[PDB]
Antibody, heavy 218, light 213 residues
């Protein structure tokens, strides 16, 4: 079967460069155009560039936003297409995909993440979230745990070291000022808290940081 | 630059017919834009459905079809199924470049309506020591997965400092999302009443908290 394998993504300062590689394996793709499409949380899909995989006939199209900056190229002997990125900006962050196109987009790669950011590796500040007196009367009590100012993704949140698995809700990370922030909550019976302790264990492998935060009544 | 627009969201039920559209700002979409349609499911899953306006790639269920409806290209799912819930991207060719649209999030009713469970958390004493204050409004177990979040401080709506996440599918395929109201420590001392109003399917749930206690 066909299989596209992508590689060469990572973190890079603005103005820097990166070159990705999409390795195609299968039957003869002389009849396909290899596309690069990037996906960001802010612009969904965004077509970047494309090349015709005819060894006889090479044609390239680029998106207006990458003209003069990006260049697409292929090497048959390696069965590979490449995207050269220069003068990268923050708007170029996203999961870059390669796709074989003939009439329709017939095959896709797994994608590789390209992050354009100047921020440094920053560990999270774990703050406890506990109900107010307006929320001390419910049969079930929702405790929480704010994870603020960390970089890069991901962090992993577990409650009571995994022994508290049902009722957990980890929310999507938001980004502000080159720094991430997400929250995780756990809802337990009001008979278990504060009688029994409840603790969020956050891990940030990038900074080799683990923080345990016990939720005590306010 | 050859902007392509699609309905941001549409909702259908199993067995019904739904029609997404695709409008070009240059003018009428024509067969010569060779309109494409790409289905995206969670986990960056991608499938090419339609090419050249109405060419269905192999393996794509017969209930999918591409066509023009006036000045737009149109994807038509006839007799939808629960596994059709996904994002559907339209792409038009413009002579020397392709352009994707914003996409359309199609919901196929797979379970009954569930109202959101809202919970409001005040700033931690730890965080205030950084002269920063963040209120956290959690939202879980709502279906379909679209919510609106409005903040009031001392009865006055807030325009700035708020940020809400895009919903996320739970194991039960209900949805969860979190909103944040970011304040200065001072600003948190300067006011007494804070509200998080979550509207879902035209019904609003509110959670407030007062520092006067």
């Amino acid at each position: 079967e066909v299989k596209l394998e992508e590689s060469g993504g990572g973190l890079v300062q603005p103005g820097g460069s990166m070159k990705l590689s999409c390795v195609a394996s299968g039957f003869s793709f002389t009849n396909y155009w290899m596309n690069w499409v990037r996906q960001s949380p802010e612009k969904g899909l965004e077509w970047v560039a494309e090349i015709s995989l005819k060894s006889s006939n090479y044609v390239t199209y680029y998106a207006e936003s990458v003209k003069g900056r990006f260049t697409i190229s292929s090497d048959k002997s390696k069965r590979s297409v490449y995207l050269q990125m220069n003068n990268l900006r923050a708007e170029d962050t996203g999961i870059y995909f390669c796709s074989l196109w003939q009439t329709w987009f017939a095959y896709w790669g797994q994608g590789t993440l390209v992050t354009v950011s100047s921020a440094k590796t920053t560990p999270p500040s774990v703050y406890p979230l506990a109900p107010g007196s307006a929320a001390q009367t419910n049969s079930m009590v929702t405790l929480g745990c704010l994870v603020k100012g960390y970089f890069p993704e991901p962090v992993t949140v577990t409650w009571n070291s995994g022994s508290l698995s049902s009722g957990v809700h980890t929310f999507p990370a938001v980004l502000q000022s080159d720094l991430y922030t997400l929250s995780s909550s756990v809802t337990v019976p009001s008979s278990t808290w504060p009688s029994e302790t409840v603790t969020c264990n956050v891990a940030h492998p990038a900074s080799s940081t683990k923080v345990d935060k016990k939720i005590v009544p306010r | 630059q050859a902007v392509v627009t699609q309905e941001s969201a549409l909702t259908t039920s199993p067995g019904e017919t739904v029609t997404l559209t695709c409008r070009s700002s240059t003018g009428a979409v024509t067969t010569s834009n060779y309109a494409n349609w790409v289905q995206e499911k969670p986990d960056h899953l991608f499938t090419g459905l339609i090419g050249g306006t109405n060419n269905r790639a192999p393996g794509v269920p017969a209930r999918f079809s591409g066509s023009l409806i006036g000045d737009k290209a149109a994807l038509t799912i006839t007799g939808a199924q629960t596994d059709d819930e996904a994002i559907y991207f339209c792409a038009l060719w413009y002579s020397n470049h392709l352009v994707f649209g914003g996409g359309t999030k199609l919901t196929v009713l797979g379970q009954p309506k569930s109202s959101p469970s809202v919970t409001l958390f005040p700033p931690s004493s730890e965080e205030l020591e950084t002269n920063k204050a963040t209120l956290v409004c959690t939202i879980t177990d709502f279906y379909p997965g679209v919510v609106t979040v409005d903040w009031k401080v001392d009865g006055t709506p807030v325009t700035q400092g708020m940020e809400t996440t895009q919903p996320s599918k739970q194991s039960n395929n209900k949805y969860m999302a979190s909103s944040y109201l970011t304040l200065t420590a001072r600003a948190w001392e300067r006011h007494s009443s804070y509200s998080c109003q979550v509207t879902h399917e035209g019904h609003t749930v509110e959670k407030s908290l007062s520092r006067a206690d």
